[model samples]
Target: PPEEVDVLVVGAGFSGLYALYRLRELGRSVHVIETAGDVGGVWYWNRYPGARCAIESIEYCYSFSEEVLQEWNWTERYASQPEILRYINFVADKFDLRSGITFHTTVTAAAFDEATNTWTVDTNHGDRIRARYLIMASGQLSVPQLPNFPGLKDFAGNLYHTGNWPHEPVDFSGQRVGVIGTGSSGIQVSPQIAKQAAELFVFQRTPHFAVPARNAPLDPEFLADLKKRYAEFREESRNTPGGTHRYQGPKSALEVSDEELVETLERYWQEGGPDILAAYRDILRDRDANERVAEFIRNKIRNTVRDPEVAERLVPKGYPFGTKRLILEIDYYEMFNRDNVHLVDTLSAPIETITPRGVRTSEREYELDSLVLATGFDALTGALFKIDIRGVGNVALKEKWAAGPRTYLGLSTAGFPNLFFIAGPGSPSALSNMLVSIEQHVEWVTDHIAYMFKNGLTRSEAVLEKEDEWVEHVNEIADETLYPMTASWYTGANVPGKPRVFMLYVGGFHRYRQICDEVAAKGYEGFVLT
Candidate 1:
């Protein structure tokens, strides 16, 4: 590796790859470091059965490249992990991104040098590189969290985490299988496992709301038409809150009568995908309005599963709809109808420990030949905390964000000069289509760096006062919605002892983009540059 570069980006995902490409276009020396052997970030690692994107294929891809938009063809409405991985690889090969990226190397430590106005980055491969700017393209959900079950190491069964699935095919035919947690991963993988497992036990702590994905092959005729106006369509998506082509229903749920409510919701439910989340305007803000939609979804779950007891258990309660990530499931509810499939309600009978044979709950022990933990991730700040990052006065980045992530526009912190985060907490990251946010961050941060180069400035950091105001603004907006009320990863609730502060800006993506643009347009206001 070179001793120094203009910029050093961590993680080889959509964000990092684009940053590298963008920086090179602007004549800035740039490099990327990835823990995985290749690109694809989350898609590269999460190869579990039935893994697929919830967002539509066309909308979830890059809009920055016209050639890529014209050339690549999507096979399905929602792309599978293999297909997404292939798409990323195609981007890497086409752009020759691999030449600028070091694979199988993790960034271990980085500290800002106040005198040099540069960051000294250390990697696990024993390479030290200095760069004027550090961009953490390390993802929001990059870190996999294993359940803190006792005797996890002593489990006799084959253990796997959805985030770290094996590259090769994992066969479970005629074997007893158990899946823990019913988040997006569990909801997708359990149905696939049911087809092969002799006995499948799905351990559910809380039933998450999921609607049918209703995924189908993309018609070539439609694709060809869409390709012609792909850029225009993507631009329209960028203006929306969810960062997709989903319609923003202008009517409040309470405004419509029961008959109209069911009719509208049923239409979206049948059309499928997560667009139903935006079926009503006040679903996330009004409790009464949210309950109407929540009840409608609860009825859908109840009707899908044949057993009333099982169906009732599957219905999500207490939390409002759209508070947590609404999962898109393909036959997940139908899996419960199978004779071999069993729903172990962990809420009623909590898990005690893992025995030699299998998991032991307060109720009973279920033996399993293989265990799959779909327990989700640390999210937002997990990957960043793994590395020892320090700034002015050698203050650790992890320590600063120990209470929760504090950033200005989700990009830079006050003390961390020349450091930037792409599509993390304090932004509309997980709440919006990630591709849209990634592209925006890459362009904005790279543009900011270019401005620095043009002006011969060496240091850039968010002003402490601006950082405080931004943090307050982010939390204040979040409190108005239903998101903070739930104990989910968005609030860092999934991680034990992690502060429960709402991490993301509940404000719309388009508005957030405007704020970022205005800041840059005004010579990067709210940032201190030296």
Candidate 2:
């Protein structure tokens, strides 16, 4: 609690909390600095209606603790925000993690002291600390983006962003609510708002491909059976491509006849969730194969919405299926059938500005009592860029990654000694089941730090040439896939003036993990230690 510590971790979410526990267990002085008052990074902030995790309840949880895993049981197939938050709180309390964390304190600036080979970190609360190691566990999608419409300040009604929602429940009852964007947030929240609001107008620039999230009550018997084989279950998940215990489609889409393809796809569609995207092997890599599945989903939309015009407008046409984020929705398409709900295709009639009453489109202005901006994040680099981080002769991190994020194994960047990124860019971060990716990163980073400490070394950094090599490798892998073609958040396409590039490694999580393990096994390859 003094002005210094061995390691300073940013964030109080799963990654940061795990870092604290691991470092503490490793017999090192560690402290966590979190902006939120409590844990649960995303869950603590996003309290909007219909906010739920796309990943299944069991798999999305931590694998570090056997006791906690066995003790806790999920109520639903897909856990809601409240349930997730409660689980996080439970973990925090059980492990007594809160005592080592500074809550409601934002890290304002962190400058690497080259002479001392440590970081001089300053917080908004005027707290200063010098730490040997800086671990960035800042969640990828932490920052919410609200585009500056011409007259946003003139909006007279209540304004809300799905990322930073109100703590208390908002009543849209009998109110005219305007929701902009059709991303995951928009897809989930629209249906809930439609039920309460007198009229809900959803403005869409691009329609996203969605699969039904068939969330249901978790079977008690299933939980008991899973508990019996919990260790093996988690291990199997850790070995998978996306870090989910999912069967990757083995057959090529081209090999199957039209009837066979339809039958295969129909089975997946009926089962629901993101698993549908995995029904064909080449769906992501080949455009023709992607189109085959995309057409099926588009047809599903046509069948759900009563009006063919509305369905046509809702169909995702521009991007390849599964290239952009495949959102797991529940009755989202069917919600459009309600007469009170309306879809404003912003691409056809773009939003001109936000006036005093409501939103002004190219064609007309709609009055609203409340406005919801479902616009996604600045993403991957946003949260990290906010800090005044500098390394190696006062080179600012922003200036360093001006072209894009460059790192070796997504763990550390060149010139930044003793700094590690837990599930950061250049790795399968947002691309994989976050929990699996996060745990692996935490273990890898902490173990590396422990090795450094044990060997009487205080400095560790990615070699400059190695960072460049790794950056190029990541990009090359991305180019091989259809991920770059979509103007989605994955490529930072949603943010204006931001570099449009696929930020996450398209290489499967298992492969990525294998590479990371190999690096460590080869005496921390591509990194310089002293």
Candidate 3:
């Protein structure tokens, strides 16, 4: 026998935990299932050295409750993974969220029963639970991707992935370390490994542009001011273009003189944050405007790194400013100055195979005691397909999305009734502040569920025609911009066998928000409500 609930939410991260809290407040019975041993979702598992939030501590938090905001105090400008996890645990404890959360348990399958208009959820623990609604809070980067390189299993040295680091601390003292990939995780962990390891070799396929984090202690005065105007800040964030920090000025970057643009870029760069792209309004949409900003960053990199050759190799060239993804780092460019650190550009010399104690390239072999793969996730659709999700007529989600994921507003797919995907593909998920996007998705689903209950609606699912149109529209918008030109995770290019579809809504967050609201107001347009 299994427990029955009104709502079943998968994932215990920020989105899952918040979903549970919000739904419970609406007087609905809820159960949260988490694969991890605790809450914090990705934060709980990603305990790699130097892992920290790139977004500002104040903005990268839960704004659902003002009381929680007033009570909690953030110590760092950019909160580390451990600190963020601690905060998550504290929230779970304070709000008694753990009772509703089933930790260390994974939901293996979820099937909608047409007769009862409910979902039958099967877990790995051999438990079968029934619920009226199924909400997936599974994160965008939750799926840890393992590279399918030959001789990986035969490697004698220790192996680890940054996304799924061990619970205990890994000491690299006096040990030679080899790190693969130069994404955000690799950028964060490589420098810390350099500090501890006897020698460190970084295997980078593509060089990534990084901005200084300029992290510091939280200012008491700033915290007070934000808390006082929390309502205004939350509302403003929802209506903003990107969903994190609203652009407080004009729309067009071409309106400003070149001198004025340079000054603005310099000021934002000095302030040191991810808001560098937001400095110019047209950076994401206009290639010429984007080039100026990209060149400015290149100059900054050339100026910072002492070695001209190293700087040239490290600076990104192919992608526009906001096309791929931008990383924020603390002393990342400066790490090349360290005597123990060495950078290997695999593009120049491709990796041949893995030796027992080192990675061998066509040119040479570098011996190491430990190897870390910081290659990022499969992104967007990977997490959801991991489960055995069967919708109407027992059609598998994996089979449906064998080519690529298709959904309406990234919320619900055709045939997946009473099942909602939070921050899923075809939305402005990874392209925006995740916290803001998560809230928007969760709230919309919650309201939809409430509406169904109030109006005696039995089942709801997106129409196939509507989903196709939305997917086509999403691709059309992406093609209009410079995003399609770059080989990025946004296009599933990082994964070997994955489809190369543009997975996000690139047309500003404000427009996406408006569309969602309009759909709801129009009695959930493009959705079949029974």
Candidate 4:
């Protein structure tokens, strides 16, 4: 790495890659440090069977380049992990971004120097670099969280975590397998394993709500038509709540009659996708309205499986619909009908320990030849917490965010000068289409950096009072919805000892983007620029 640069970016994911490209276009010298061997941040690591993007491929890619838009042909409506990885690789090659990135390198620590208004960063490879600006594009779900089970290391079978899957194809042809957790990855991978494993045991603590993806091949002719208006379509997506072409319902769930509610939701259900969350506007904000939707899905789950007991075990309860991250599944519920598949309900018979052969619950022990932990990530702040980031007065970022993450726009926290975060917590991050969020953040932050350079400003930091107000505003908005009431990774509930505060802005993505624009337009208001 060079001794110094205009900017130093962490994590070579979508956010990082875009930031690098944008900064380079602005004529700024920038470099990126990534732990992965190549591009495709989460895609590079989450190569598990059935891994796929929930968003439609038409709307999930970069909109900065018209060449990439027309050149890359996506085969599927919802692109699978491998295809997405290839797309990322194609972008990397098209932009020649690999030249500015150092692979297999992890940033271990970074501290701001008050005198110079720059950051001194160190990596695990013993490389130290100083830069005027630091951008963390490390992503929300970058850290893999393993379940805390007794004797977890004692499992004699092949163990795998979905977040960090093996690069090569893993064959489960004749092996009896057990998978823990029922999150998105668990819902996706279990069915594939059921087809291969001699016997598949899916240990579920809390079943998450899922809808059929109804994924299909993208029509070549339709793609051509879409490319003509791709930029305009993307602009429309930026103005929406979820950052996709999903229709926003004008009616409220509670305002409709039972017949109307069922018919409208049933249409979306049959059409298949997570858009059912938007079938009625009040599904997320109103409790009774959400309950109606939840019961409809629970009844659907009940009707799916042949065994009543197993069906009930599969039904998600005690949470509002759309509160947790919505999951899309293919052949997941139908796999329960297979003789080789079994549902291990850990909520009733909690896991006690992992034995040499397999997992042992309260009722009995099950033997398996392989084990998979589909347990999810530490979420928003996990990856950042791993690094030793010190700001003014040498206060650690983790220590400052002990109760919860504090930021003005999820872009920068107080006391950290010249540092920025792309799609970080306290924003509409996981709540919206990530690509839209990533691109917006990349543009806004990069523009701000360009402004700083033009004005010859050396330091920028969020004002402490503004950060406090933003944190309270985020909580207040979340409290208005059903999201804060649920226990999910969105609230850091999946990670043990993590704070229960809701981590994302519950407001619409369009609203959040407007707010960011206003902040920057007002001479970067609520920030100290020197």
Candidate 5:
């Protein structure tokens, strides 16, 4: 490392890049270290086929720069992975952010310097940096989880994962492809693979809720109109819960008549996107109301596939609608209608092992030239746990959070003074529009650090009592809803032996921002500074 800096940010994703920009404006000497060769942390690595944003392109971008916003023209409603990565590169180059960032560098460990009120950060690049503060921009779903299946290495053909796909173009024209898991990645990629591969087999464990993306070319006239009142439109989004410019239904699903409910639900299906969940207020709260909406979508799934048994296996049952993260799919259900495409219901016929040339289930073995795992990430606390982070009295973060992560507004944790997390646990991360929540956290943390410097304060940390109260609050809000009932990655259920607790804040994004602002306004309440 060069000279000591005011702050050292980990990961050069959307959060880290923004932190670098804003912290520099605050006159802080900050440097960023990223594991990826270039910028675009998630988008850089996950270069899988049919990878696209769930949110609309117009809303899922940087609002901090007016020039960047006006100059960049989005072609599609939902941005593809390539376009998103290009956007990240454009922002980094435009802002001169790359020079301050050390690429291909992973932070191995970090230790608190009690006497100097600083941090000693160790990276895998054989460099040690001493800084005043350490801010973790490591994303919630950055760490890819690869399960150890029996005879995985013995598979003779190619094996791929959506999380860490090959950088070069992959041609599956003549090959037979077998894809595992039906999460967001699986749902998005299967349709694209079906178009190329001669024969495609999808191995699904638990079927997930997927809605039509309805992706189309965005009209220039509509976009130009949006640009005129962009600030006002964004402000209106901040006022709402999920930070989208969509109208949330005020009426409860339970209160609506059967005809009215079906009519309302049918309209959302026609219009497309993830707005079907927002068609009513109590879809996530009431089980009876949720089932009514779920059955409507299940019927749609059955209508898309020709085989009744195949369609029935695809329908997601046993969970409340919208409890797990809702995914947007483009002709995902319709892909199953293709003659060469087959569905392997692993729940019914479990995978026994992998043969040399194919995957062997309890019933039979199916041959495949390639296997693609859309198996998702460890989520929330996975990336952070990779680093050996020690706090007061040499307390490791893994040991401190043996049960689950505890934080004050998901920004700062007790015993880790001057350390902050972006899109971390105990926040409305993964539950809301990620960009909205990320920018809010980066601004708050950077502003707080600036405040501390201005006040001649060297260190800052959350009080243990306040952190305990915040953890309890996160749990209380989660328990109030049906979110905790599902075994999704949000509850750390995807990873075996990991804690089975809801890691995200169930409180709305707008409300979470309000609480963060309130705490900051009150001289950074529930935090101790030295």
Candidate 6:
């Protein structure tokens, strides 16, 4: 017998938990299925050293409830994994959300039965459930992608993936640890691991440009002041270009004087993190403007690292400043100063295979007790395609997305009915404050669901033609910018043999939101509600 519910939310992360909470508010019976044993989704698994949220801690939180915002205290500017996980747990406990969640459970397959107009979800644990609506709150970067180096299975030493770190603490003390990949996770964890490990070898393929985190404690007085204006702050965040709770600065970098521009860039650089990139309005769009910011960052890196050669290697060149994902670092470049730390440029000397002790490259063999793969996930489509989800006429999502992800609005696919994706592809998800984007997605999805219920609609799917148009628009927007030219997770280039199509919409969040609102206002234009 299959358990029945009004809504079956897949995931226990911010998206899923919030979807469940909101659905409950709409007087709907909801059940959440999570692969992890608890909430926090990515945070639950990515317990790697120094893993933290890139967004400001206070702004990255749930803004739906003023009570929750008022009660919760964020200690740091950017929250670490543990603190973020704790916050998720707090939300779960406060809302009594754990009762409706089936933890440590994976959805094996989901099939929409047209006759009954319900989705039959099968779990890895052999549990079956049927629901009126299937909300894939499955996160964007939930799927852990393994590097396809030969002899990985033959490796004798302990191997760890930052995406799927051990629940218990990993003792890297006195151990020779070799970390692969220099993306966000690697950039964040490498420094911390280098501090603890006797020897730390960082295998870098492409040099990543990282801005200092400039982390600081949240002022009690400032927080109190901000709490009073939470509503206005939240409203203001939605209207921003990136959906972040900060101003985008002057309209164009060219508008400001050279002195003013240099001063502003310096101020943000000292202050640090993702905010620095947003110091100028034309950073993403204008190449010369981006170079100005890039030169400023490169000069800053030169000053930070003691070694000139190492500093030169760390400074990213060629790509536009914001094209490739911007890495926020606490002490990444500075870690090279440590005697135990070593950087191997894989481009010069490629990784041949994984040895019993460590990694074997063309240049030389480095021995290590532990190997950490900080390589990122198969972003956008990975989580959605992980499960055996079949849409209308048993069309497999994996087959459809074999080329690449093709979502109408990064929310719903053509064949998948009553399925909503939060901050998925074709949106400014990775480019913006994810919390704000999540809220917008949730609200839109909930409103759509309500409209369906009111109109006695059984199913709603994205029109195939509209999906094509949206994909074209997404690519068109990417073409206008320099994001497509770079090998980034945004283009699924991190994973071997993956398609090279740019996944994100590249358009700003405010514009995306307007498009979504317009679609809804036009009685769900470009979507068929049957």
Give the better candidate number (1 or 5) by TM-score.
Answer: 1
Native-referenced Cα lDDT, model 5:
0.90
Tens digits of per-residue lDDT for model 3 on 1-530? 23899899999998999899989888888989988988998899899999999877887888887788888888888999998998888888878898898888888999888888899999899989999899999889999887657777878999999999999999999999999989899999998988889999999887888889899999888888888888788778778777767455465567778788778888888998788777766787888888888888889988887878877778888788878788988887898888888889888998988888789899998888999999889888888888999888999999998888889998999988888888878888978888888888999999998899899987998999999999899989988888887888888888898888888898877899899999999999999998
Off by over 4 Å in 4: none
Candidate 5's residue-wise lDDT over 194-272, tens digit each?
9889999999988998988899999999888888888777778777688787669999888889889889888898888
Best by lDDT: 1
Q: What tens digits encode model 2's per-residue C-alpha lDDT throughout 89-206?
A: 9998998999999999999889998888899899999999999999999889999999757888788899999999988999999999999988899998999999999999999887
Candidate 1, run of 10 with poorest lDDT: 145-154
Off by over 4 Å in 6: 254-261
| TM-score versus the correct structure, for each prediction | 0.99, 0.99, 0.97, 0.99, 0.99, 0.96
lDDT digits (tens) for residues 203-310 of candidate 6: 988788888888999999999999998888888888987777665676577677778888988888777778776787778878888887888788888887788887
What is the lDDT of every predicted structure here? Answer: 0.94, 0.90, 0.87, 0.93, 0.90, 0.87
RMSD of 6: 1.7
Reference-based TM-score, model 3 = 0.97
Query: 154, model 6: CA deviation in Å?
Result: 1.7
lDDT of 6 at 195: 77
TM-score of 6: 0.96
Better of 5 and 6 by lDDT: 5
Q: Candidate 1 on 1-530: residue-level lDDT in tens?
A: 67899999999988999999999999999999999988999999999999999999999999889999999999999999999999999998998998999999999999999999999999998999999999999999999998867899999989999999999999999999999999999999999999999999999998899999999999999999999898899999999898998999999999999999999999999999998888988999999999999999999999998889999999999899999899999999998999999999999999999998999999999999999999999999999999999999989999999889889999999999999999998898888999998999999999999999999899999999998999999989998899899999998889888999889888989999999999999999999888
